[PDB]
Write a protein that binds this ligand. Structure first.
Ligand code: NAG
Lengths: 43, 49
């Protein structure tokens, strides 16, 4: 399970930038679906 | 369930021995435990293997 990422400070804009590997995890796990997590408004 | 009665006056045939069992094998996952790569220095400017 590999993750590539990049953090560049400033609808998506227009440009080219290659992303570098961060981690590589020998898990073995199968994936068919995913979701996301968000920080709600409470205060 | 029975108990033990270890005492420090016993003979060798009853003294409590500590035993640990190392059961290890590979999986098709990447090997998360290797061995030693033999130590050795590094030379320069020589045709070497
Ligand atoms: C992932 O799912 C496939 C079937 O879609 C299965 O054949 C395969 O063995 C699974 N992989 C693992 C690592 O369980």
């Amino acid at each position: 399970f590999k993750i590539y990422s990049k953090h560049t400070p400033i609808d998506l804009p227009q440009g080219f930038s290659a992303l570098e590997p961060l981690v590589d995890l020998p898990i073995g796990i199968n994936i068919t679906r995913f979701q996301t997590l968000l920080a709600l408004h409470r205060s | 369930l029975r108990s033990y009665s270890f005492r420090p006056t016993y003979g060798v045939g009853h003294q409590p021995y500590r035993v640990v069992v190392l059961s290890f094998e590979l999986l098709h996952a990447p090997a998360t435990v290797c061995g030693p790569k033999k130590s050795t220095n590094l030379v320069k400017n020589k045709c070497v293997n």
